[PDB]
């Protein structure tokens, strides 16, 4: 029962985030969710508590998408499909983009969410590389930067050009495909330690 | 007087760009003057506000980018010239968080800004078109892709931090690889912005 209201607050907050960024108060989230103000406060005493819950919820969402991508028949199509689904979340919602990348997070819940997501990202990259589709320099830590890159397009271009991020996402994915005439990427992706220290 | 005023202008801009790499846009007008070895009154009369200093830096930055495109067109190979130019362009904002904020987070207008953009844009088109006509660069590419290469590589440095100061070069190389013309590639479904669109976005 309380878990149902918890999901409704998160879903209502993500809807408001696409238009209002992070400016919406807990009262406005409660109205949009159709819940009493005390119900949102009993679930999330502060906005930072709501912000962290949305971040962890977004990671759990990426995990389910990565698990679905690993069920696809072709590992390259699974990789491209996952990148599409991942980047769309933050490229079309400036509030989520601010939480995902322009925010530092920590604590037990955040660590447990990253612990589930990071190995799934590794398996998606590993499978496409083993079948010869994805270039061998690729890493699981390239995935967050695909989200950062596509989100920065929408942040700069604005809502008038709301689809422009798809152009540069397609360019990025094409640059990741393995070709014979490709030079080794001189700068390696961040390792597990570096990507951890970057977003905390 | 024109030779001396031009020297003090380049002095202030170079000192501001050097401070902005470390402090972002937090450096004050007085700190810029001390770093330039110029009197506070001289810099203050030239730039009474931080916003005036940001516009002169931005206009100077487009002039620097115009010179880089000019040099790139003198390279013997059109693809190496395109690669070299994109590297030189992105390095400006990918290694200086203050310049990155001025280039893509501030709004810019006025006669000097419009005149600078009008000289830069056809030079960007010539670098792109040369590599396209040789069969290296994919036909969908446009001059208006160039500012987004700066935005994209800049967001890498913004997210990764100064401890990972070279990471932007990795994703730049990925972007450049994805711009190659291929006999078999799917056409980019979303077109680059036109001049009217990229002027409104800036």
Author numbering:
A (entry chain A): 14 to 213
B (entry chain B): 11 to 212
What's in the article?
MAB_4384 belongs to the type I class TetR family of regulators, characterized by a divergent orientation to one of the adjacent target genes. These proteins possess a conserved helix-turn-helix (HTH) signature at the N-terminal of the DNA-binding domain as well as a ligand binding domain (LBD) located at the C-terminal part. In contrast, the binding of a specific ligand to the LBD induces structural changes, conducting the dissociation of the repressor from the target DNA, and the subsequent transcription of the TetR-regulated genes.
The crystal structure of the native protein was subsequently solved with the partial model obtained from the SAD data and refined to a resolution of 1.9 Å. Analysis of the crystal packing using the PISA server predicted the existence of a stable homodimer formed within the crystal, consistent with other TetR regulators and with the SEC profile of MAB_4384 in solution. The LBD is made of seven α-helices, α4: 60–82, α5: 88–104, α6: 107–114, α7: 121–143, α8: 155–170, α9: 178–188, and α10: 205–211. Interestingly, we noticed the presence of extra electron density in the LBD of chain B in a rather hydrophobic pocket. Due to the occurrence of an extra electron density within the LBD of MAB_4384 and that the closest structure of MAB_4384 is LfrR in its ligand bound form, it is very likely that MAB_4384 was crystallized in its open conformation, i.e., its derepressed form that is not able to interact with DNA. Residues Arg55 from chains A and B are about 56 Å apart. From these results it can be inferred that the DBDs of MAB_4384 are too far from each other to bind to the DNA groove. These observations combined with the presence of an unidentified ligand in the LBD strongly suggest that the MAB_4384 structure is in an open conformation.
